[PDB]
């Protein structure tokens, strides 16, 4: 009776930054994947560990819809085994990831004439993120021998940095909105099923 809330995940009025990527938990609903099928507006769309065609007829225990915003050059980092600022310090996928990744150009939405600086990433971190880790700590990154007593300055840098999203940026630096649909099947009842009941 109840469809899975895939609309409020994509057609949401506004997404979050990459370091605070926002997670929606999908359980107890019939999964209508056709919103992926008909919508050809998708620039990037790749599924790992599972086929998209053989998906609408397979029951899973839980689905996890992560959503955030990055730039074009960084989109290829949203995948297992990848490295980079986004993959290492913002959003890391496990090597045995089984799901799909979707991304589309949102330059019309997430760009202001003066540069929309609301979206952020983490530029520094003492170690790489574990898979599906969401670090949002604003601890001053220590870069030098002198310890940082919560103060900025010489080798004391603020860990977060802002994107410079302008309408006139090249397609490489334009804002893309990204959604990662991860899937989990455990020794437990499958609450999410395609139309094949």
């Amino acid at each position, epitope marked *: 009776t109840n469809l899975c809330p895939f609309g409020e995940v994509f057609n949401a009025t506004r997404f979050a930054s990459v370091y605070a990527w926002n997670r929606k938990r999908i359980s107890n609903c019939v999964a209508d994947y056709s919103v992926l099928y008909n919508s050809a507006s998708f620039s990037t769309f790749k599924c790992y560990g*599972v086929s998209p*065609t053989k998906l609408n007829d397979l029951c899973f225990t839980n689905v996890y819809a992560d959503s955030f915003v990055i730039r074009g050059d960084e989109v290829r980092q949203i995948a297992p085994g990848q490295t980079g600022k986004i993959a290492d310090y913002n959003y890391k996928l496990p090597d045995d990831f089984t799901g799909c990744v979707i991304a589309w150009n949102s330059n019309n939405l997430d760009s202001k004439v003066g540069g929309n600086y609301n979206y952020l990433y983490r530029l520094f971190r003492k170690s790489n993120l574990k898979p599906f880790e969401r670090d949002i700590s604003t601890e001053i990154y220590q870069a030098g021998s002198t310890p940082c007593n919560g103060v900025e300055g010489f080798n004391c840098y603020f860990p977060l940095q802002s994107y410079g999203f302008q309408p006139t940026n090249g397609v490489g630096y334009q804002p893309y909105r990204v959604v990662v649909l991860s899937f989990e099947l455990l020794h437990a009842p499958a609450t999410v099923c395609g139309p094949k009941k």
Partner: antibody
Amino acid sequence: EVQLVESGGGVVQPGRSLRLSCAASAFTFSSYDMHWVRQAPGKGLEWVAVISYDGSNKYYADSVKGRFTISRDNSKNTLYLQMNSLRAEDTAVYYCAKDGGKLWVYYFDYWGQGTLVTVSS
Amino acid sequence: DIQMTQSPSSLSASVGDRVTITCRASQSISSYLNWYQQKPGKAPKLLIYAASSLQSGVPSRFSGSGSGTDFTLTISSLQPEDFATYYCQQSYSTLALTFGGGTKVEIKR
């Protein structure tokens, strides 16, 4: 006993269009995902595109996305591959292939003998 | 993207020898690797799918193995109708299927 018959290959100039067709036989065609896979002369094999068993889903490689178009007619048991704006990189023998579906992921169960498509001006 | 390094690039082996071919992945694939045969000119043909599952109608002498990145195809006793170029093919990246370079098996002499 499974057969696939490609046809429609031939010489073609750059930027033109060409229609390929695979005729399936001896299995339930309308219930298997279908594949196109190409192989340049002397080079290795290259996955091209996928269409679902119902024809609702259409997926392409990054080298041909927005430039080829896969389709299928289940009543005629045929698999179509429209090739618009052919470049020199497309010069290859193209194969149609049945998925098999025994996995959550795509594999190639049976191969057609293929048809030659040469792009040259 | 995922690349597949298949080694050796070309080998020489006579009939009856225990032939082994290695296929290595740029990153982890659970077990979604596939081994294909291709005679010169003829179309390819499925031998092994999903690491080590023998396709129906393929001789029992063929056998796959391996998990993670370093996979292996093995012919226990080579036969004359087996001299052909063997490809390996990953599937984990479903919407970006990539194959290996291949390993032609030439008749040793």
